[PDB]
Design an enzyme around this catalytic site. Structure first.
Site, short mmCIF file in Angstrom:
data_model
loop_
_atom_site.label_atom_id
_atom_site.label_comp_id
_atom_site.label_asym_id
_atom_site.label_seq_id
_atom_site.Cartn_x
_atom_site.Cartn_y
_atom_site.Cartn_z
N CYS A 19 0.86 -1.17 0.00
CA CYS A 19 0.00 0.00 0.00
C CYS A 19 0.89 1.22 0.00
CB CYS A 19 -0.94 0.00 1.20
SG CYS A 19 -1.93 1.48 1.30
N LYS A 46 -9.59 -9.59 7.38
CA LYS A 46 -9.41 -8.43 8.26
C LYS A 46 -9.87 -8.78 9.67
CE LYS A 46 -11.26 -4.72 6.13
NZ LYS A 46 -12.23 -4.78 5.01
N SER A 72 -4.20 9.15 4.92
CA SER A 72 -2.77 9.40 5.01
C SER A 72 -2.34 10.86 4.96
CB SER A 72 -1.99 8.58 3.98
OG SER A 72 -2.18 9.08 2.68
N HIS A 159 5.92 1.83 -7.35
CA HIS A 159 4.94 0.97 -8.00
C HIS A 159 5.01 1.08 -9.49
CE1 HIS A 159 1.93 -0.35 -4.80
NE2 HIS A 159 3.00 0.10 -4.17
N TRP A 206 -0.62 -6.37 -7.21
CA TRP A 206 -1.26 -5.94 -8.44
C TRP A 206 -1.83 -7.04 -9.29
CZ3 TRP A 206 -3.28 -1.67 -10.07
CH2 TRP A 206 -2.82 -0.42 -9.57
N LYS A 209 -5.54 -7.35 -9.97
CA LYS A 209 -6.15 -6.07 -10.37
C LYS A 209 -5.84 -5.59 -11.80
CE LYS A 209 -6.18 -4.69 -5.61
NZ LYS A 209 -5.76 -3.70 -4.59
#
Length: 213
Positions: A19, A46, A72, A159, A206, A209
């Site tokens: 993340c 979770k 954030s 990333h 990734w 996705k």
């Protein structure tokens, strides 16, 4: 004490995950030389106590004073005003430099067209960054010292590097030499190496996705 919930690595719940927002927070924590407990949250499974304090299941979440705080930007802003030294504030003029790179990168990464011009849209954002870097003193966006914008931008450009390299065999063109220098400067930051996701886990993060059902 400070504590932070961040994403666990996809397929390795006991390793730090991919993340970019969590990393921004970790980078800030490291740059203020703060000590913190780390909670590696598996976003598949979770845990209950985590849902009790981030009721949307979003991550990063930082325990500061009493409260658990999400988002954030908010997390890094609170840290800046609570631990002023060393300062990480970015001059307002440069605070948004590079802010559309992660967005256009995500879109190019998921493109199956190749004529949708998503690659061009990404190139334009890189170009805008090259332009900033070449005409303002470095090595960081706001000069001699690392500041908020660099810490927000570093996880995202990592990333971009890892993901487009792996998924598309694609690299920042050699015609952005300042972007290349800036990424090497960021990836070899001390706090970066202390908080970086292994490439494996950017790839596994990734993988489901890139091209979903």
């Amino acid at each position: 004490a400070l504590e932070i919930c961040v994403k666990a690595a996809v397929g390795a719940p006991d390793h730090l995950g991919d993340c970019p927002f969590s990393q921004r927070a970790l980078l800030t924590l490291e740059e203020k030389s703060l000590t913190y407990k780390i909670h590696l949250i598996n976003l598949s499974d979770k845990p209950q106590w985590f849902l009790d304090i981030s009721p949307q299941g979003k991550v990063p979440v930082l325990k500061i004073d009493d409260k658990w705080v999400t988002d954030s930007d908010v997390i890094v802003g609170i840290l800046e005003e609570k631990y002023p030294d060393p300062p990480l504030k970015t001059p307002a003029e440069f605070a948004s430099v590079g802010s559309n790179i992660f967005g256009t990168f995500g879109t190019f990464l998921k493109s199956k067209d190749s004529n949708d011009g998503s690659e061009h849209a990404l190139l334009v954002e890189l170009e805008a960054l090259e332009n900033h870097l070449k005409s303002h003193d470095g090595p960081f966006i706001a000069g001699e010292r690392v500041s908020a914008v660099d810490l927000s931008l570093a996880p995202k450009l990592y990333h971009l590097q890892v993901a487009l390299g792996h998924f598309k065999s694609w690299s920042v063109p050699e015609s952005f030499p300042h972007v290349h220098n800036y990424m090497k400067t960021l990836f070899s930051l001390d706090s970066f190496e202390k908080t970086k996701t292994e490439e494996k886990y950017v790839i596994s993060g990734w993988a489901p996705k890139v091209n979903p059902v």
